[PDB]
Amino acid sequence: HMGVRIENNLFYVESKNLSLIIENRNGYLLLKHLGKTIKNYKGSNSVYERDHAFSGNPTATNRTFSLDTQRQIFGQHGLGDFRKPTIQVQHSVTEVTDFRFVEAKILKGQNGPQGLPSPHSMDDTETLVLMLEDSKAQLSLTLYYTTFNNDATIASYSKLDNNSNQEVVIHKDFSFMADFPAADYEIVTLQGAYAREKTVRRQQVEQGIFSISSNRGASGHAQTPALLLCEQGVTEDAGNVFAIQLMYSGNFEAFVQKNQLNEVRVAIGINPENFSWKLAPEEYFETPVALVTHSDQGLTGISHESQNFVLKHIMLSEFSKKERPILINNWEATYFDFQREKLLELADEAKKVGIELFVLDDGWFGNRFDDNRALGDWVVNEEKLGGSLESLISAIHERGLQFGLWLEPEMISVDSDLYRQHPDWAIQVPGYEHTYSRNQLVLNLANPQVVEYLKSVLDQLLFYHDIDYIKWNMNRNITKLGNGLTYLETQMQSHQYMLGLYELVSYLTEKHSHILFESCSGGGGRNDLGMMRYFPQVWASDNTDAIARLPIQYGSSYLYPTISMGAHVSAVPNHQMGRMTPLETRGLVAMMGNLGYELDLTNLSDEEKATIANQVNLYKELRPVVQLGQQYRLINPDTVSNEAAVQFNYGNQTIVTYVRVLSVVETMETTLKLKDLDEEGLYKLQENGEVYSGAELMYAGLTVILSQGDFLSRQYIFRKL
Amino acid sequence: HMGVRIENNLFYVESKNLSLIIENRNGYLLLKHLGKTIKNYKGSNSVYERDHAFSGNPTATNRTFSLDTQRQIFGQHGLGDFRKPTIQVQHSVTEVTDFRFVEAKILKGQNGPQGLPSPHSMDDTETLVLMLEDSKAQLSLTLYYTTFNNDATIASYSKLDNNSNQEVVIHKDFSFMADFPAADYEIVTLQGAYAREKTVRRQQVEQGIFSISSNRGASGHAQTPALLLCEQGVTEDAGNVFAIQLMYSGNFEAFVQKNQLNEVRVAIGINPENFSWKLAPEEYFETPVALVTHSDQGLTGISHESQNFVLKHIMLSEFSKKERPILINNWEATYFDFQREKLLELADEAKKVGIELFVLDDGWFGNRFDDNRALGDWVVNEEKLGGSLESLISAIHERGLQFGLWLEPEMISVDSDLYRQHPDWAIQVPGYEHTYSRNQLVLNLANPQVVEYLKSVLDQLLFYHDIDYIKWNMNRNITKLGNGLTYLETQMQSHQYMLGLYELVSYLTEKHSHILFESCSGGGGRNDLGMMRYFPQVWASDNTDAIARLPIQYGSSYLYPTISMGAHVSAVPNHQMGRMTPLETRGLVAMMGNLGYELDLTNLSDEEKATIANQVNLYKELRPVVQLGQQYRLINPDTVSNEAAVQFNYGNQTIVTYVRVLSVVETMETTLKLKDLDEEGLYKLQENGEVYSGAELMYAGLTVILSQGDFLSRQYIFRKL
Amino acid sequence: RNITKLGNGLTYLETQMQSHQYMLGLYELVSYLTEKHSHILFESCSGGGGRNDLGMMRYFPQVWASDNTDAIARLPIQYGSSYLYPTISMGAHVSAVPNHQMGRMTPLETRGLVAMMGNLGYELDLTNLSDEEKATIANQVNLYKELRPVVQLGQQYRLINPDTVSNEAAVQFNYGNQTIVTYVRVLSVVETMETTLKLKDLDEEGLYKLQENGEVYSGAELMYAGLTVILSQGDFLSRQYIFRKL
Amino acid sequence: HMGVRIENNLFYVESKNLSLIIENRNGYLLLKHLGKTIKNYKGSNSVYERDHAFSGNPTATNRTFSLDTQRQIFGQHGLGDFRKPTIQVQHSVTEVTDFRFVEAKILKGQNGPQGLPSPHSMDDTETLVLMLEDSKAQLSLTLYYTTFNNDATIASYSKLDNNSNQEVVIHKDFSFMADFPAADYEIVTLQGAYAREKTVRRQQVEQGIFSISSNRGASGHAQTPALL
Ligand SMILES: OC[C@H]1O[C@H](O[C@@H]2[C@@H](O)[C@H](O)O[C@H](CO)[C@@H]2O)[C@H](O)[C@@H](O)[C@H]1O
Ligand SMILES: OC[C@H]1O[C@H](O[C@@H]2[C@@H](O)[C@H](O)O[C@H](CO)[C@@H]2O)[C@H](O)[C@@H](O)[C@H]1O
Numbered sequence A, B: 001h002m003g004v005r006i007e008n009n010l011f012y013v014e015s016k017n018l019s020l021i022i023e024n025r026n027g028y029l030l031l032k033h034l035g036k037t038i039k040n041y042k043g044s045n046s047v048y049e050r051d052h053a054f055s056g057n058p059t060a061t062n063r064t065f066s067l068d069t070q071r072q073i074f075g076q077h078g079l080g081d082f083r084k085p086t087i088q089v090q091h092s093v094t095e096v097t098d099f100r101f102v103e104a105k106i107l108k109g110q111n112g113p114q115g116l117p118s119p120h121s122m123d124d125t126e127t128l129v130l131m132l133e134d135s136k137a138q139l140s141l142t143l144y145y146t147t148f149n150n151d152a153t154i155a156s157y158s159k160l161d162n163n164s165n166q167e168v169v170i171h172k173d174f175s176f177m178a179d180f181p182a183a184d185y186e187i188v189t190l191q192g193a194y195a196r197e198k199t200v201r202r203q204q205v206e207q208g209i210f211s212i213s214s215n216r217g218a219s220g221h222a223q224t225p226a227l228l229l230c231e232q233g234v235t236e237d238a239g240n241v242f243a244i245q246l247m248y249s250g251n252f253e254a255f256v257q258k259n260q261l262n263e264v265r266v267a268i269g270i271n272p273e274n275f276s277w278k279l280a281p282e283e284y285f286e287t288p289v290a291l292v293t294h295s296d297q298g299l300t301g302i303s304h305e306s307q308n309f310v311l312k313h314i315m316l317s318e319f320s321k322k323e324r325p326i327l328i329n330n331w332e333a334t335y336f337d338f339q340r341e342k343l344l345e346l347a348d349e350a351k352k353v354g355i356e357l358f359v360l361d362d363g364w365f366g367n368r369f370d371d372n373r374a375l376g377d378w379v380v381n382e383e384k385l386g387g388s389l390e391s392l393i394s395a396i397h398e399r400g401l402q403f404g405l406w407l408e409p410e411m412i413s414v415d416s417d418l419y420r421q422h423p424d425w426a427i428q429v430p431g432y433e434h435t436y437s438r439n440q441l442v443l444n445l446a447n448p449q450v451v452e453y454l455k456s457v458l459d460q461l462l463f464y465h466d467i468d469y470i471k472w473n474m475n476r477n478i479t480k481l482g483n484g485l486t487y488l489e490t491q492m493q494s495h496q497y498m499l500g501l502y503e504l505v506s507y508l509t510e511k512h513s514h515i516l517f518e519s520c521s522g523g524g525g526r527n528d529l530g531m532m533r534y535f536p537q538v539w540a541s542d543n544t545d546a547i548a549r550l551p552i553q554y555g556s557s558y559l560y561p562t563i564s565m566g567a568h569v570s571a572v573p574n575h576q577m578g579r580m581t582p583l584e585t586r587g588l589v590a591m592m593g594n595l596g597y598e599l600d601l602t603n604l605s606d607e608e609k610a611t612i613a614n615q616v617n618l619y620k621e622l623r624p625v626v627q628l629g630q631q632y633r634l635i636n637p638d639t640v641s642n643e644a645a646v647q648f649n650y651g652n653q654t655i656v657t658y659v660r661v662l663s664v665v666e667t668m669e670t671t672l673k674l675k676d677l678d679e680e681g682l683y684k685l686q687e688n689g690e691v692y693s694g695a696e697l698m699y700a701g702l703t704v705i706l707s708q709g710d711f712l713s714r715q716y717i718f719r720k721l
Numbered sequence C: 001r002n003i004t005k006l007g008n009g010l011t012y013l014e015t016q017m018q019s020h021q022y023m024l025g026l027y028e029l030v031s032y033l034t035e036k037h038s039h040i041l042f043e044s045c046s047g048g049g050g051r052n053d054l055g056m057m058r059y060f061p062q063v064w065a066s067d068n069t070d071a072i073a074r075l076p077i078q079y080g081s082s083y084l085y086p087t088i089s090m091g092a093h094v095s096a097v098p099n100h101q102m103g104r105m106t107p108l109e110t111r112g113l114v115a116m117m118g119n120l121g122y123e124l125d126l127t128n129l130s131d132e133e134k135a136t137i138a139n140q141v142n143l144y145k146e147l148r149p150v151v152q153l154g155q156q157y158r159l160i161n162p163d164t165v166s167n168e169a170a171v172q173f174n175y176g177n178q179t180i181v182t183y184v185r186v187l188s189v190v191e192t193m194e195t196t197l198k199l200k201d202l203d204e205e206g207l208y209k210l211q212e213n214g215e216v217y218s219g220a221e222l223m224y225a226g227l228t229v230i231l232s233q234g235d236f237l238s239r240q241y242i243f244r245k246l
Numbered sequence D: 001h002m003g004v005r006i007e008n009n010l011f012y013v014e015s016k017n018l019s020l021i022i023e024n025r026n027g028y029l030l031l032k033h034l035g036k037t038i039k040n041y042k043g044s045n046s047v048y049e050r051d052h053a054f055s056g057n058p059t060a061t062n063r064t065f066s067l068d069t070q071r072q073i074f075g076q077h078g079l080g081d082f083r084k085p086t087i088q089v090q091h092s093v094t095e096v097t098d099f100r101f102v103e104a105k106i107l108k109g110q111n112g113p114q115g116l117p118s119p120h121s122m123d124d125t126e127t128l129v130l131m132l133e134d135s136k137a138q139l140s141l142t143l144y145y146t147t148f149n150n151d152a153t154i155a156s157y158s159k160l161d162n163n164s165n166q167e168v169v170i171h172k173d174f175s176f177m178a179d180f181p182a183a184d185y186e187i188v189t190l191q192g193a194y195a196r197e198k199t200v201r202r203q204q205v206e207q208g209i210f211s212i213s214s215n216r217g218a219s220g221h222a223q224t225p226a227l228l
């Protein structure tokens, strides 16, 4: 049985196979249990209350009760707890608050913070509402924990109300916190860099503080809003994992603190850096939604839990189970140097190889002949497109292709009519020169005039043209914060930018819900669950190298479903890596994701065209297995591995892709075992027609054979009889 | 379905959840699969046959078939395989054989090598008989693999027949071998030392050869005939383990070889060191029984599999499910300095505290006033015992106690009437002085006159006296091998010693099957599955320190059931460690084994007596749980841990023992989770009367509280309602 | 090949002796010939490095280190082959691409630099090379005629080891006023800061002139600050730094 | 100062920056020190002699002296030492020998086994000759340790003489052995394969036995005769 229960001084937040059990102790909220379902909880794992040196107390005479030593669900500074705080509010002469629990309510169904991405399909949920108050400060803090009946996830966020007669200022307000008992733990995060997104990092939890964060105004290439706290020795198949994630695309922080007693605090939320929030009397602030997800089936377990939750409750329903079009994108193919004839020729060749969607990338607007001007000027360059965008689109439609278009709405060039008309719309500081990045500036989406302008321009573009797909780019990070009329308004502008962004994209994606929106930020610079609420796929990386893509796809699909993960067959030598890779391998690597093509098909040989046509026919068949099926990692492409292998199951279909990076010699062949088959099932391998029991494939496995050479790959395809 | 099947050129050896699948390829036997059950095996994991440099071939023209690169079940040297061989026979001018498979048979039921310890309760077994021949040498080698319907174990051994007209000499003859595919593996072994027996060692498999062995004539304190080949990252709860073990108590070797291709060979058998075996025409040789055991449930899984197999098919049925008597042993209590009055006084005190069996240790025979004489002279010292042994035994029986007696039959003192009468009975080399050890010598049990003498003397002792229990000691290792009439007979004498030992002990244990025989060799110097075939318990270690016992019991019960594992509450300061430990902790540690007492009860305070009486009452209750129940390790006492914890389940009873070695300060309490409970079960904790769901105990766990101090312990006792 | 089927003795014991007696026979043979013909340079070989030990190096002052002539596969091979044995012993040949063992394309420049960390030779059909490839080889030969004393007679310092996990190799040689450093990167990288490569065993106060840029660095700078190693995008790229002490 | 010195019951084998210091204790040879040069060695790192369980003794009454627990320069089986032996000779009905030190000599200059590759340029070397005998077996084993004045290396080999009236058979005869004190150690070896020769392997020393070997009649692609 699932939902929320209030029983004496215990609160039970009960998702499928995941419970949070909280105790109200004289107004303080204690974390009793987070993990597998327990009913009729007694307190076997309660904190033993004793006098801990230098851990102080709310009363003079009781030295054994201390907020320094109790496990909690939110953290304050100044009451005796010295662990990192998650709520900190300035009021009058202090930033000490003392919020005490006053009352609990339970909601059913749809619920979430206004103006921020939050779960959908909530009919079968309940929400615990914990109302806290600081009577002296006249502030309310309300905590929300939501259950899901079909996933081992709990969602959380908070609302702070200013009920005083004076302005107060929020300095810290995280979205989730948990104190976990002293034990050995490891943490897994996704970090990396541009052209190396979502690098899987694992390390031991150590005394002190570990954190990942972005202060870039976007979640960023080099850190994802995720942190997995794992049982010592977790594997792909076994051990406990708790994943905490944030539905937010701006500045965030995730941290793990191991304190003097060996206790462990984890939290995720808006980054304190670049953040303050003024609340006038009666104003309130709601934090982005955090998620806590649990598996006892190791890292594959947490992958499945997280992917499932995303598919059912974050990604748009219109697209979450919809096969995505195999596209051609002209960017690597032509860069800025294209015109109508070139486009239609590429379109002709795309149609012959059976590509479904044609995406016109950067350079169709203003005088965008390079990347030094024109952002902000969303006017069609009819000279370059050889007529109206309407006529181009009709040409593409008549060739039997869907039509897609690149935008970069959040940005403005100095050399643009937009900047000439409104220089103050850029994020900037009075009396400081601009800081430049790709020779462009960032629009101040905290400015409601900026949001109104973008709604208007883009609504016009989408209503007047038959566009099937949008690629929404964002190509630099935020510098030079100083657009407020006061310091405090500037401290607010990075979050207000996000609120402006989400108002913009929720509006457009809702008003034009037939269009497939793909998010992008120089590839994976903003690939988070805030964006995935509105954009059901993402350009995972500008790195289109088949081999460099292996660790990238490993990370990009670790917590996020494969269907989200844009991957394109590109030209050789690869433009990022300077590498030759077999076209077969480029195909197989991209087919572990959401397949498209990005190279000049008009300059291919007849053979290369035929190969691509064969790849497209293959993927039309594999697409449901890849995009709708269950993913199992078999060999991980980490920093030391010479191999990658990934399996997908979907009904009677099982496929396995294998890649080897460097050629080897006098080395026994790898034995590759499949997972999650029917032991008694009979599995027919397409290439040799042999029929194997599931037991054989899982417990004996495949001897993997390759010729001599680098970057070779192969695919095994099975049908269950 | 289980048993043996022969299907075309495949042989299926099918135990419960464990299969060995062998292929006959033109007379060569290939290991196709060892692991979880596969029916209708096709060969997904077959070796890919290619030309490997310097890996030679049986024929001129086929460079891709090589015994250097095929996975096999026995190993020869000289045919192209360069991995370590497991069969090597000298005949004429060579020790090259080439045994080729000729014929297979299947047996049902009881089967095993003559004169060597082998499984019992075999009604539901089948045995594959693989008959190989070397036609040139006129030798037969026959391989036996036996299935068990109720355990994931396969047993193996071999018989070599000399069908030639000339003497041949066996140089190597192991009992089991398997070639496992290249992969990452770890190995677990039990090593250690005297007073540190069965230390659990884990390490990575590396290129080259790793081995443990004994050349001591006994398996030894410092290595156990066991080797666990484990999937990388195995834990207590997860991953694959293959345990290979030998039912033999003499010289053995276990090795793991990782070759040039990254392939891995494991084998166990009689040590080549100190071994050669002459076979005259028509003679044969059978190897000891090896066992291969499998779990996919990690190290606890392999513990359970191995323990179960031992309980049901090795340990005597008369005792394997029989609760063992709580004993008093006088050794640490008095050493050699005792007489009748002292003994009966100790007996009186043992009876008052509710002890069940009284064991008279060393010093009752000949003029054994110290450890410098009398071994060999099994004549009762009636002066010291104040009358006949018959009268002493009656005195003990009348006090309501069973009676036990120490023997050391395999040994002889220079200062003894035995040595004076028969100096040639000692193991020795003509013209060399003796090597001494504890100032004694080893009898040559390869001498049939020696075996006859010991049968006679001991049969006399046991038939003329009402003895309930025997402690069978063996206190030095074998030096100075030179009793043969030829070099070859000397090379045979270490194995013949074992055959003599097993003839002796199988005879006596069978003719006197009501007596409980406990094996001993300065504690755990010979604690192996050869001895456990006849002796259902073993003195695990002379180290009776509660704290030093923790790693010892960890290892001693790792593959062997707890019921086997003698453990005694002894005096403080401890005689080996020089350590004070709480009597409570001495009790709890010994109650994780087969409980007895070994200290001078006549010199205890009234309080200490009362404590012991309480310990005895407690264990009478825990004994079935401990001895008959299922063991779960919760925290392991390894080289770095400050803690030990072990759980036992038995029907509605669950107990957990916790020990902390060093006092800690300002350190959060450990959280201890129980295993293998009913999630919905209700578990009532005796000490506080609180009732916890199994889910709470398994997923939240117990906060473990202790006072300040070293070597503290506690016990949690639960009844399921 | 290796030895199988031991059974040439008139008794079992003579057969047990025959593997050692084989060696005694071999050593009698090779000590005789190498002594009677001591002007000849004898290079030992056994499908490359099948018998590369100090028994053989007593008579054969160089050895064919490996049949694997792949520039990249050669990195761990040379690491081991020169670990206890001097570089002068260690035969290394520039061979054709794609490499015959690995099936790999590697730059001719890298094939040259890797082989020049050993005892340089060539093993490919020079008659089927382009004019350019011939010229490159002629330049490699001129370079090594100069480096040969440094490599073969100088002191070797490993700076970055090509082990199972490293993406890099670097080896330095010092010989009087000459110091050279060879650097190889196996896989192309992106958005990764350049490696800092510090030299060893220089005079702190010595002045070291780098041939490629003419800049003069103190030994302290080269040892304690080190070189920022720059490469283009691509696999199996290499470079060489050459210094003269003034 | 380098070369070989015999001082009371100590033997000093002194290469440049490397010494082997051996003690004759009633005919048994004990490894006192192998490492950096020590003159006037006193025995700070001597084995503490105590009764170790199941470690037996050459005499009845002294339980603290055991070849199972003494650090040695050659290993025998059957006298109480259970570590792997490096000399094992069959004679008559046994392969137990008991070689006891009898006499030491010092050579200067060129020296080595006949018919086997051995160092050259030996003008500035000295060789310690340790003559051992088994009087019952009538066998001689002679150990040679050679110094080099210009390198931190010592060379070794042995000669076994059959002085009996019967055929004997050598089963094991290694060229060098050292017992090192309990401590944490790693080992480096060169292994690999054809087309992957001399792969550098490093690992922790663990309880039990680790070995590399060739049974191929050549040292082989996959292991080099070296251990660090
Ligand atoms: O401008 C079109 C382009 O935008 C984004 O990526 C670019 C990248 O291709 C270029 O070479 O560098 C800059 C950074 O300096 C950007 O990251 C899109 O991700 C890309 O797909 C393309 O649409
Ligand atoms: O002699 C009786 C005694 O035999 C075995 O152990 C002894 C040990 O107590 C003594 O102190 O040392 C020697 C070794 O030098 C033996 O190991 C039994 O194991 C012991 O229980 C006792 O019965």
Ligand SMILES: OC[C@H]1O[C@H](O[C@@H]2[C@@H](O)[C@H](O)O[C@H](CO)[C@@H]2O)[C@H](O)[C@@H](O)[C@H]1O
Pocket: B053, B054, C045, C046, C047, C048, C064, C067
């Ligand atoms: O036969 C000439 C050849 O001999 C040795 O190597 C060969 C190798 O080239 C060949 O391809 O394979 C076999 C093994 O099956 C040998 O290893 C020399 O090492 C080589 O240089 C060449 O001289």
